[PDB]
Design a protein around this ligand. Structure first.
Ligand SMILES: [Mg+2]
Ligand SMILES: [Mg+2]
Ligand SMILES: [Mg+2]
Ligand SMILES: [Mg+2]
Ligand SMILES: [Mg+2]
Ligand SMILES: [Mg+2]
Ligand SMILES: [Mg+2]
Ligand SMILES: [Mg+2]
Ligand SMILES: [Mg+2]
Lengths: 134, 60, 144, 182
RNA sequence: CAUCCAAGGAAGGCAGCAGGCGCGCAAAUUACCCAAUCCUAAUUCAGGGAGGUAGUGACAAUAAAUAACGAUACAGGGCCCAUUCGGGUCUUGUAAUUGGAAUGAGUACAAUGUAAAUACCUUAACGAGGAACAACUGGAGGGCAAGUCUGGUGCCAGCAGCCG
């Protein structure tokens, strides 16, 4: 009596982005939310596409449980999904990796420190070294 | 004598009143229950129809 | 018919007549002259802190025989000195000499209330803590 | 700097706050319909006052005037859709004749009481507040859910609730577990 | 009005976001990030304390928990009449009696949410008996709803917006 059933309302094709947009209306009694990955797979064999060219987000299990609503897109190919989707969705789905970024404060500090020096820091390092030498 | 102490001393009656402790009570229901209690006590359990309602009638 | 003109082109004298008559009120005159900022102990201020100079009690009027426990406070914002009232029963001892006290209005539009002569300000807080919390022993004076 | 969204007051305390007859009437209406505070009666009176202000403003306008026709029948249809105004008197002059008790009657509280699935008005209040009644497979934990005429037929206990058919709940499940263990 | 100073010199502009001193009755965290709105640039990609997200926040504003229902003992009204009765025949309250339910406020597997996280919506597993999971703030002479009850002080202490 689980029977998670899925529906795609307001579906619009879109070769502008080589996608198909829709709102995901998932009816699921006696159950919590649908754990996006599982619903991505459900849409994957629903629309005859791989589990990689399918994305869902913006979900909201309505008040009182049961129904839930989100937004979903199905891309014509996995490559188009790779080259059109935001980075954070490509990180959620495991098809990309979180970029090794220093924190914003450190980046700004380093930017100002680079501001202090005109041109490359090659000459100034040796100049300062031989300066404190004497 | 005429006056039992220094007359103009501040906090006199407060100082010498007998400290009587609060009497412990059952919980008084609050919210909708309190309004229901008041409605029952006044308009379906009319106690003293004579004269006025006389809520809080002194015992004499 | 009446004292005021009634013609369709008499807006000017009607307006200036009202404008000259408005000074007869007290609220309008105070608001426009701005006497509150210049003369009152507080300039349009509901509350003000001050320093207790000494600790006085003031006798009441004829029909009421008692001594209301006051306190002379020099205001910190400008330096004026005003008497103020310590409201409740055992609160005189709570406020000690030379501690910061937050005086408030006395509720009668800057005029003496009841039988207390020459006072126009309550006492709400002392040394950062409120008098009502001290009087019911909810908080205690920090004694700094 | 973002465009604000407008909060607005929804009640108005009476100017004479201490009227014996009015206080007794307010307590009557609070006890009859299990209202938590007397702010509920103020809110219904404020809604009724807005409705009456609109009705009187439209009445002042001349008969057969586009404003009168359009917004008068709009208000009429809205009120009959709520259900407070009976279909017999869709005239915009009986709108001025509505009483606060009329809007009080259409609350989901009193409707659950009328349907009988709650045997007491306070029982209706608690049953609504415990997420049991669902107006069309959608629970409403709010007593002041103004039930409209088109949807009153769809009040019943929700499926997730034990009354609509589900697991019983904390106390019953614990008692059953204790009985099974011992 | 200030800062470093090797006393020769050098460098200043928060009524930007933070934060500090002061002032005053009076007003927030040196937080996260370009996800969203957009903007700049050679221009998708870089950048943006613009901005958004959170932190504090009883400025204001909305909805709304703090119990609900029985079965018993003390009672009251419509009563079959009125042999005193009185069954309570018909109901409505009061009792530290007494039972079974329902539920959140909290915790918390998860998943949703989000740039990432909180938080909300959903939901496992716990989570109500004095349901101590305990609602306060003012007032009870009049204005103005509610005491000419008990004790204390006796024109003191104090109350009182006004009359008192
Ligand atoms: Mg600043
Ligand atoms: Mg800003
Ligand atoms: Mg402030
Ligand atoms: Mg907080
Ligand atoms: Mg509580
Ligand atoms: Mg009290
Ligand atoms: Mg008092
Ligand atoms: Mg008293
Ligand atoms: Mg009265």
């Amino acid at each position: 009596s689980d029977a998670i059933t899925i529906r795609t309302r307001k579906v619009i094709s879109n070769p502008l982005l080589a996608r198909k947009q829709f709102v995901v209306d998932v009816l699921h009694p006696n159950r919590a939310n649908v754990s996006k990955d599982e619903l991505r797979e459900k849409l994957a064999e629903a629309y005859k596409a791989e589990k990689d060219a399918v994305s869902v987000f913006g979900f909201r299990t309505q008040y009182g449980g049961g129904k839930s609503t989100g937004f979903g897109l199905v891309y014509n190919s996995v490559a188009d999904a790779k080259k059109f989707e935001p980075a954070y969705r490509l990180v959620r789905y495991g098809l990309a990796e979180k970029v090794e970024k220093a924190s914003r404060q450190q980046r700004k500090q380093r930017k100002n420190r680079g501001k202090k020096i005109f041109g490359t820091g090659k000459s100034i390092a040796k100049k300062a070294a031989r300066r404190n030498a004497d | 004598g005429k006056v039992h102490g220094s007359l103009a001393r501040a906090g006199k009656v407060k100082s010498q009143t007998p400290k009587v402790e609060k009497q412990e009570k059952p919980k008084q229901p609050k919210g909708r229950a309190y309004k229901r209690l008041l409605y029952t006590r006044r308009f379906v359990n009319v106690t003293l129809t004579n004269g006025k309602r006389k809520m809080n009638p002194s015992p004499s | 018919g009446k004292g005021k003109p009634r013609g369709l082109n008499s807006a000017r004298k009607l307006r200036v007549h009202r404008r000259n008559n408005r000074w007869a009120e007290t609220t309008y005159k105070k608001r426009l002259l701005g006497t509150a900022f210049k003369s009152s102990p507080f300039g349009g201020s509901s509350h003000a802190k001050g320093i207790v100079l000494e600790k006085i009690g003031i006798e009441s009027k004829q029909p009421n025989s008692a001594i209301r426990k006051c306190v002379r406070v020099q205001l910190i914002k400008n330096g004026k000195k005003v008497t103020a009232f310590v409201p409740n029963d055992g609160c005189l001892n709570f406020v000690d000499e030379n501690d910061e006290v937050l005086l408030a209005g006395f509720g009668r539009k800057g005029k003496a209330k009841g039988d207390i002569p020459g006072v126009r300000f309550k006492v709400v807080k002392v040394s950062g803590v409120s008098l009502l919390a001290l009087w019911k022993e909810k908080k205690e004076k920090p004694r700094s | 700097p973002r465009a604000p969204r407008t909060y607005s007051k929804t009640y108005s305390t009476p100017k004479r706050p201490y009227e014996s007859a009015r206080l007794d009437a307010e307590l009557k209406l609070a006890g009859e319909y299990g209202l938590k505070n007397k702010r509920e009666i103020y809110r219904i009176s404020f809604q009724l006052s807005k409705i009456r202000r609109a009705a009187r403003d439209l009445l002042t306008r001349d008969e057969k005037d586009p404003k009168r026709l359009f917004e008068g029948n709009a208000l009429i249809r809205r009120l009959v859709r709520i259900g407070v105004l009976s279909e017999d008197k869709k005239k915009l002059d009986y709108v001025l004749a509505l009483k606060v008790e009329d809007f009080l009657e259409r609350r989901l509280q009193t409707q659950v009481y009328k349907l009988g699935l709650a045997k007491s008005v306070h029982h209706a209040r608690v049953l609504i507040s415990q997420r049991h009644i669902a107006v069309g497979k959608q629970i409403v934990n709010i007593p002041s859910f103004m039930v409209r005429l088109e949807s009153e037929k769809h009040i019943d206990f929700a499926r997730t609730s034990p009354f609509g058919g589900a697991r019983p709940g904390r106390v019953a499940r614990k008692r059953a577990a204790a009985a099974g263990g011992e």
